[PDB]
Amino acid sequence: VHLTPWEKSAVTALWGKVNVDEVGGEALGRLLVVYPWTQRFFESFGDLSTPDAVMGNPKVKAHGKKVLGAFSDGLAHLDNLKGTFATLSELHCDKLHVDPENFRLLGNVLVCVLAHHFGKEFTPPVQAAYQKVVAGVANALAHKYH
Amino acid sequence: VHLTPWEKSAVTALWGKVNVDEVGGEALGRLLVVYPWTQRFFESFGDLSTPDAVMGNPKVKAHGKKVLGAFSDGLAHLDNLKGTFATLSELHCDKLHVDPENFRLLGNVLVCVLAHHFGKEFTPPVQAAYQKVVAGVANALAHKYH
Amino acid sequence: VLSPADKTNVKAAWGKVGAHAGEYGAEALERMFLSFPTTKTYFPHFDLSHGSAQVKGHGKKVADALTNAVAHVDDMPNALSALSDLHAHKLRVDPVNFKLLSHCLLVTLAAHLPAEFTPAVHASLDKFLASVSTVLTSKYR
Amino acid sequence: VLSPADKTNVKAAWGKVGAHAGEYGAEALERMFLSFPTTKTYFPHFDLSHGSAQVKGHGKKVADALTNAVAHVDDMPNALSALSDLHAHKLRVDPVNFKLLSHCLLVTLAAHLPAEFTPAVHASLDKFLASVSTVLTSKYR
Numbered sequence: 001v002h003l004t005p006w007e008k009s010a011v012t013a014l015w016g017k018v019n020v021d022e023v024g025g026e027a028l029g030r031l032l033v034v035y036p037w038t039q040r041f042f043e044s045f046g047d048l049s050t051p052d053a054v055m056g057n058p059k060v061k062a063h064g065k066k067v068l069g070a071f072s073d074g075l076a077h078l079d080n081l082k083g084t085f086a087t088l089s090e091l092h093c094d095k096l097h098v099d100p101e102n103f104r105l106l107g108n109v110l111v112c113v114l115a116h117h118f119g120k121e122f123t124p125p126v127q128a129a130y131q132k133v134v135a136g137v138a139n140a141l142a143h144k145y146h
Numbered sequence: 147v148h149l150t151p152w153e154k155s156a157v158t159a160l161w162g163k164v165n166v167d168e169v170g171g172e173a174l175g176r177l178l179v180v181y182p183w184t185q186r187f188f189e190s191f192g193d194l195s196t197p198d199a200v201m202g203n204p205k206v207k208a209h210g211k212k213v214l215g216a217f218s219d220g221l222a223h224l225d226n227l228k229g230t231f232a233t234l235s236e237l238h239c240d241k242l243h244v245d246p247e248n249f250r251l252l253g254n255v256l257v258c259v260l261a262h263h264f265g266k267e268f269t270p271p272v273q274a275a276y277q278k279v280v281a282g283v284a285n286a287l288a289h290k291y292h
Numbered sequence: 293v294l295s296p297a298d299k300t301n302v303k304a305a306w307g308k309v310g311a312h313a314g315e316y317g318a319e320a321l322e323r324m325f326l327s328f329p330t331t332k333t334y335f336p337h338f339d340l341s342h343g344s345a346q347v348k349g350h351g352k353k354v355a356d357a358l359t360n361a362v363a364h365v366d367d368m369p370n371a372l373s374a375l376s377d378l379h380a381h382k383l384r385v386d387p388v389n390f391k392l393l394s395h396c397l398l399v400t401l402a403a404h405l406p407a408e409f410t411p412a413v414h415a416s417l418d419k420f421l422a423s424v425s426t427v428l429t430s431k432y433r
Numbered sequence: 434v435l436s437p438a439d440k441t442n443v444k445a446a447w448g449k450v451g452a453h454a455g456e457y458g459a460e461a462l463e464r465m466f467l468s469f470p471t472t473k474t475y476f477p478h479f480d481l482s483h484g485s486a487q488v489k490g491h492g493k494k495v496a497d498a499l500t501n502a503v504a505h506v507d508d509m510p511n512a513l514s515a516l517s518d519l520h521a522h523k524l525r526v527d528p529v530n531f532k533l534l535s536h537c538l539l540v541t542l543a544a545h546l547p548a549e550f551t552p553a554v555h556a557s558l559d560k561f562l563a564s565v566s567t568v569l570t571s572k573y574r
């Protein structure tokens with residue numbers, strides 16, 4: 001959504017240190033662990049029995065890098081998240097049939113993962129900036145639902 | 147809000163048959179009975195200890211008329227509820243300190259009241275139309291919170 | 293916690309729904325599908341048109357579970373045991389959706405029970421639906 | 434329902450917090466006020482600036498009450514009885530804000546427990562804060 005000029009820079013800065021592939025697998029992995037019902041969409045992924053299994057699942061990691069790579073690209077379009085994610089929105093609603101609530105939940109996990117990996121650097125203002133980002137991305141992906 | 151042409155008609159048509167004063171008191175009263183915590187804002191109103199006390203309270207009935215009156219007035223501006231409730235939004239935040247969730251709770255109640263008052267005339271498609279309206283009014287009223 | 297008054301209110305109003313429980317369940321589903329499109333993501337295998345055989349079928353199932361819950365308001369977790377199992381381990385319907393259907397079941401009841409839907413009964417019914425939802429979501433995590 | 438491992442995980446993580454709990458409470462509050470401004474509607478009597486005496490003090494209170502809950506994890510309803518009474522009868526904070534503060538407590542812990550905050554502990558801590566939220570709001574109606 002509307003971040004301030006400084007918030008947009010805080011986001012941009014922090015993200016320059018983010019290994020998208022790793023944070024992607026980590027974030028999606030924790031989503032399946034903390035909110036196990038999200039696993040409903042990934043039966044084909046194989047072993048998702050324990051946290052160590054989910055986190056170590058190669059399909060989970062690979063899907064996580066895909067999901068976060070798309071999220072990453074969208075950061076270059078902060079002022080038009082609705083437009084940049086429109087196609088993905090239709091796909092998640094029409095083909096994938098994914099409840100938008102899942103996007104909000106992954107957003108919660110992503111923030112926890114950033115806080116975790118960055119520590120003190122992920123300050124309250126930096127968090128506020130990313131809250132606007134994950135909320136905007138979730139609203140943008142949910143927008144074309146019908 | 148983003149209603150379709152027919153939805154805009156259904157809203158106006160139904161609303162014309164609405165007695166704002168009667169429905170405003172009913173809706174505000176039911177808000178206080180159904181979600182008792184909302185009473186936090188109306189200490190000056192006096193007796194609000196029981197459902198009958200609340201529903202028969204003159205101040206609740208008066209405030210209901212005022213609130214739904216502003217809601218009614220807003221229905222003539224579905225094209226820009228933001229600008230319409232901008233001042234009110236700033237007032238509920240800075241002066242009254244009202245949590246925007248209260249606006250959504252009032253919306254749920256109103257829909258129930260419209261359902262109760264109109265019976266089957268409040269068809270599923272009419273409700274969907276009113277859902278976007280109460281959602282949009284709540285959103286417009288929340289827009290100026292900071 | 294459903295007080296004795298809540299249980300009395302609930303049983304009276306549900307008692308009034310009676311033979312229409314099936315028709316009401318199907319109507320609440322439709323109200324939900326229309327007002328909150330996201331909920332349809334759980335029914336891609338369903339024909340969701342008005343008067344659908346699947347909607348009617350599922351609406352009757354939903355209503356019957358509610359009838360059972362009401363007849364056992366004093367021990368719902370036990371009465372809805374296989375049901376909380378089904379939603380937690382198979383369906384996996386995100387918890388936020390339960391409030392949407394509760395809202396629409398309330399709306400449906402309001403539209404059908406002119407005399408019965410008093411503010412108090414309205415309050416008791418809201419609590420009851422939230423209880424059923426709490427139970428149905430109890431084994432997710 | 435918090436499992437045995439959940440309670441083991443919670444106690445272990447919160448123990449690590451240790452003497453920093455109050456400081457973390459204030460940080461959690463600051464993160465919540467900034468990321469979710471609507472929660473500030475409940476503190477119009479507070480100086481909400483970074484480092485304010487009021488937020489510092491309230492952060493300690495919230496942390497201690499969480500330490501109290503951790504100490505009585507098998508019976509939180511009774512242990513937090515006076516607090517659930519307070520929130521339901523006086524403060525009357527709408528139930529939705531509890532999830533907001535829980536999110537920021539969880540984020541504050543992640544920010545301070547590089548080694549401790551594993552996926553499993555993440556899950557248990559989230560469940561824990563949700564339950565504490567549930568009891569503090571259990572007497573709302």
Ligand code: HEM
Pocket residue numbers: 038041063066067068070071088091092096098102103106137141
């Ligand atoms: C930040 C939000 C998300 C982004 C940007 C994102 C991105 C994507 C992308 C780029 C694809 C591949 C689609 C294609 O181009 O062919 C995908 C697939 C998919 N996404 Fe999302 N996604 C998000 C969150 C989620 C969440 C939270 C869920 C559900 C827990 C989800 C479930 C799926 C599923 C089921 C697939 C299909 C995987 C398969 O091939 O089996 N996504 N997503």
Ligand code: HEM
Pocket residue numbers: 184187188209212213214216217234237238242244248249252283287
């Ligand atoms: C559709 C929703 C609402 C609208 C459009 C609305 C409208 C109004 C208006 C017109 C005023 C008077 C402003 C003035 O001229 O000074 C007002 C005041 C007030 N509203 Fe709202 N309101 C809404 C919902 C609510 C809700 C749900 C709450 C909280 C439960 C709330 C709490 C108040 C309070 C406490 C006052 C102060 C005046 C008094 O009652 O003494 N309002 N509102």
Ligand code: HEM
Pocket residue numbers: 331334335350353354357358378379383385389390391393394424425428
């Ligand atoms: C709040 C009250 C709810 C009740 C009492 C309830 C009850 C039921 C019942 C009785 C069944 C049929 C089980 C059987 O045939 O063995 C069922 C299935 C199902 N429910 Fe729930 N449910 C509730 C909420 C939800 C919600 C909120 C959704 C999603 C918006 C949902 C989605 C489903 C789905 C996906 C099925 C299976 C549909 C099919 O394939 O036929 N349920 N539910």
Ligand code: HEM
Pocket residue numbers: 472475476491494495498499516519524526530531532534535562565566569
């Ligand atoms: C994990 C959840 C929470 C815990 C453990 C908690 C704990 C407490 C405690 C220990 C007190 C002090 C009681 C006393 O002085 O006797 C209190 C006060 C307060 N809490 Fe809660 N609370 C929680 C959530 C919330 C939420 C979500 C809000 C709203 C955003 C809230 C708003 C307040 C307010 C307004 C006060 C009074 C502050 C003052 O004037 O000093 N609390 N809470």
